From Swiss-Prot:
The chain holds residues 31 to 340 of 413 of the full protein. One of its GO terms (cellular component) is intercellular bridge. The lineage of its organism: Eukaryota, Metazoa, Chordata, Craniata, Vertebrata. Residues 66-76, 145-166, 240-246 are extracellular. It is a multi-pass membrane protein. (S)-timolol binds at D83, T88, N234, N253, Y257. This is Beta-2 adrenergic receptor.
Length: 281
């Protein structure tokens, strides 16, 4: 009396994510005015979110709704690697989108030298290859297996499929994928806010007859609320045993996946993007 209802909501999530991603990608592709050296990162983020929505959510929904995996043992390592790759790529793309804006605000005269047409391609290939180095390599070669008697059968059994990681690969992946982008964002956005406050003070002193707080607050809060608890609990259950159950872990993992849907709404707000979206329909 409850399986039917949840499926509708999860399918709506899938539809919203895919619709937003496709709309952003086609808006960037069709119109020449939107092409900019700082818009390639948006394209990469949209592609990563679309890959997440197309190859991550449906399999998880099928696994959750149905009793058993009902697929081969080979596909589980592919699915987990795809999830890890997509999450890491999204996080690092967000970090780059923060870094280039910090460079633009801090030093405007030399902003042209730092970012060029070829630089975006190089940085995107580098960031994606770093994301893929930690996804396929340590999973496809079975470097993350655990020594516990529990889940040894799960590795052996083709029907069972759930995440069980060693002590290293959990903390190492968390450090690589979450904490460094968070620190970089915090520092650069604090500096940007300081510069904006100084400029506002100067103009208010010049003209003898806020607003950035809302933007910075939403930008930081969406990401933090979406991705903070999952990595904390990921660290803790490996640090100590019997700390959590599995249902809470799965629920936090699923609620972390909704971030990719909100990013197109959060990021594209310029009048040019609105005019383009109007021109689509
Ligand atoms: C079960 N899904 C995976 C499992 C572990 C993991 C995820 C995301 C980023 C990481 O760095 C991870 O180690 C999750 O999306």
């Amino acid at each position: 009396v409850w399986v039917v209802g949840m499926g509708i909501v999860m399918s709506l999530i899938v539809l919203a994510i895919v619709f937003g991603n496709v709309l952003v990608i086609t808006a960037i592709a069709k119109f020449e005015r939107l092409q900019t050296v700082t818009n390639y990162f948006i394209t990469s983020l949209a592609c990563a979110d679309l890959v997440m929505g197309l190859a991550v959510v449906p399999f998880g929904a099928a696994h959750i709704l149905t009793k058993t995996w009902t697929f081969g043992n080979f596909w589980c390592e592919f699915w987990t690697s795809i999830d890890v790759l997509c999450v890491t790529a999204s996080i690092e793309t967000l970090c780059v989108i923060a870094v280039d804006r910090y460079f633009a605000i801090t030093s405007p005269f030399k902003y042209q030298s730092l970012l060029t047409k070829n630089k975006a391609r190089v940085i995107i290939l580098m960031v994606w290859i770093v994301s893929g180095l930690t996804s396929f390599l340590p999973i496809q070669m079975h470097w993350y297996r655990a020594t516990h008697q529990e889940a040894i059968n799960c590795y052996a059994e083709e029907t069972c499929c759930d995440f069980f990681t060693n002590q290293a690969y959990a903390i190492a992946s968390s450090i690589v994928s979450f904490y460094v982008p968070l620190v970089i964002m915090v520092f650069v956005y604090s500096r940007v806010f300081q510069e904006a406050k100084r400029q506002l003070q100067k103009i208010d002193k010049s003209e003898g007859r806020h607003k950035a707080l809302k933007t910075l607050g939403i930008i930081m809060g969406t990401f933090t609320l979406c991705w903070l608890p999952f990595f904390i609990v990921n660290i803790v259950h490996v640090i100590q045993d019997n700390l959590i159950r599995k249902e809470v872990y799965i629920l936090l993992n699923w609620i972390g996946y909704v971030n990719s849907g909100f990013n197109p709404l959060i990021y594209c707000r310029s009048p040019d993007f609105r005019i383009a979206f109007q021109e689509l329909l």
